[PDB]
Design a binder for this molecule. Structure first.
Ligand SMILES: CCOc1cc2ncc(C#N)c(Nc3ccc(F)c(Cl)c3)c2cc1NC(=O)/C=C/CN(C)C
Ligand SMILES: CCOc1cc2ncc(C#N)c(Nc3ccc(F)c(Cl)c3)c2cc1NC(=O)/C=C/CN(C)C
Lengths: 306, 306
């Protein structure tokens, strides 16, 4: 019993974190096999970041300008290239701690764990979601760039996020491990604003199922609804529209609890229209949207990794 | 920017987790040097747990009855003893992944990270606090016993919690690594109820400082208070009394923000008396009490480990 915001164990990723310094800038890199991946803005001054021409800035850099350090030991850089917004630094030694891994570009609404690092050293681990506006709500200070987000399934680490930028409003933007930004964001210090922070409806429903499983059941009611009715309410409250695909994904939680998805939708509708009247659900006074259906099943079932 | 419920990186602890099976019961153990620590109730049936005589049950167990497996490899048990509510299984091989470590008995109000495990395999990591009533609000299923809680400072892992029991109300009880339960709880399946879940006042104040640092400042007001005045309010709302020791511990956050501790207390007083009027602080609609002053400084400053 109990339901917590839970991250994946981070050891497999800790063993891949290195420090990358180019001139005056230090950030973190990800060492997998004989390649270190890091944000291309390692090559910029803070002057450069207003309007950088990365191809021109890179011309002045050679292999020996990229100082890569794994713990106390220096790595020898034997090549470098730019791929979208990341650099790939080829080193002469394969990381002996390289786990089984994949690079995945996640969809908005999916969750992942972040290992926040500074100077190639781990500071902490927490759970995030790719928001519908393609930002994440992380915890990142100067020097955290190149920290990564990931999921684990049994023994395989799927890396999905590398941290690049903080917007003036305090939320975060980054790339996949191919160096393509999520959303419209760019690696320049400019006027870029986030769009509407829409709530991830299917995740809220999953968390209501988690609540029922764990004995929080005061919000269950005598009502049902339809997809189209419920979506009229979702729209008013800036929730994502619920689709039949979402209903299908909630099938397993519906079967476990015996609560039809549309009945749970009717509970959510009343919560949106009436609020929580000073009560809590799983220790929260708001409707939580950063647990996916798979996260709920996983945590409620004890799935393990390594 | 950003403030998240953040756990310590878990790799140092992942490398210590093993599976322990005694007869029909499997749970997790902690392998440090040549000793495996686990809950003594590994020796019980579910029959036995209503009224177990552990000394008598242990008489029927020999070294070869404790099956200890680290990943895919079996460990040879060369001795065993009971210390309070834990067993210490001496094995013939020191754990090559043993980190620098200490055993610490934490005080109520202090926080720690939990690595939830099943069958000796890590499932996830999350952050907890020792509540004033000596329970923790974790996420633990059958098979998670022997999972541990810990803090890290640079390279040293301070283990403070081993999981033993779930109370009928869904909260959790366990021991330190010497096998002494936190609070009055016992390792029998009996009528034991938790006392009042008091809110950790100094932690709420720390989190309000974290909020100010991160730009959430709507709750600041024109008022101040005194320790004795504020505590009249703390008492009504089942908050721990604030002491001068707590004020002193908040000194560094007071200095960073320029907000006197007692002025912040006056903000908290208004929040307790008026509620949050539908607003949020650091993404929460309630007053968060599981960040310590040290947690706030650490997360806001980027401290690292390994
Ligand atoms: C930790 C001990 O093992 C389990 C404990 C559980 N405790 C509670 C609930 C609940 N409720 C579980 N299952 C569950 C079901 C369906 C749901 F939708 C939800 Cl949320 C939860 C549990 C599942 C566990 N383990 C498995 O399911 C293992 C299966 C593996 N096979 C493919 C071979
Ligand atoms: C990640 C890059 O490094 C830092 C970034 C910071 N960003 C914001 C704030 C803020 N605000 C910080 N400090 C801080 C101060 C006092 C407070 F009370 C709070 Cl909460 C936060 C920061 C501290 C950092 N690093 C250090 O403090 C290192 C010192 C080590 N020496 C002993 C040698």
């Amino acid at each position: 019993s109990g339901f917590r915001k839970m991250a994946f164990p981070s050891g497999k990723v800790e063993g891949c974190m290195v420090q990358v310094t180019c001139g005056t800038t230090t950030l973190n890199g990800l060492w997998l096999d004989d390649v270190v991946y890091c944000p291309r803005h390692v090559i910029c001054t803070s002057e450069d970041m207003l309007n950088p021409n990365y191809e021109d800035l890179l011309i002045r850099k050679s292999n020996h300008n990229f100082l890569v350090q794994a713990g106390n030991v220096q790595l020898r850089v034997i090549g470098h290239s730019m791929q979208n917004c990341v650099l790939k630094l080829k080193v002469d030694t394969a990381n002996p701690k390289t786990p089984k891994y994949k690079f995945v570009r996640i969809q908005p609404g999916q969750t992942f764990s972040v290992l926040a690092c500074y100077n190639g050293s781990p500071s902490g681990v927490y759970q995030c979601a790719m928001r519908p506006n393609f930002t994440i709500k992380g915890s990142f200070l100067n020097g955290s760039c190149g920290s990564v987000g990931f999921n684990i399934d049994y023994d395989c680490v799927s890396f999905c996020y590398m941290h690049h930028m903080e917007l003036p409003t305090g939320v975060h933007a980054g790339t996949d491990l191919e160096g393509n930004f999520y959303g419209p964001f760019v690696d320049r210090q400019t006027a870029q604003a986030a769009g509407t922070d829409t709530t991830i409806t299917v995740n809220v429903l999953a968390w209501l199922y988690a609540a029922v499983i764990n004995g929080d059941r005061w919000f269950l009611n005598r009502f049902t609804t339809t997809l189209n009715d419920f979506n009229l309410v979702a729209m008013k409250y800036n929730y994502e529209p619920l689709t039949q695909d979402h209903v299908d994904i909630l099938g397993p939680l519906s079967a476990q609890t015996g609560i039809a998805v549309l009945d749970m939708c009717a509970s959510l509708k009343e919560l949106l229209q009436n609020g929580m009247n000073g009560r809590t659900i799983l220790g929260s006074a708001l409707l939580e949207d950063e647990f996916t259906p798979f996260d709920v099943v996983r945590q409620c079932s004890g799935v393990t990794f390594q």
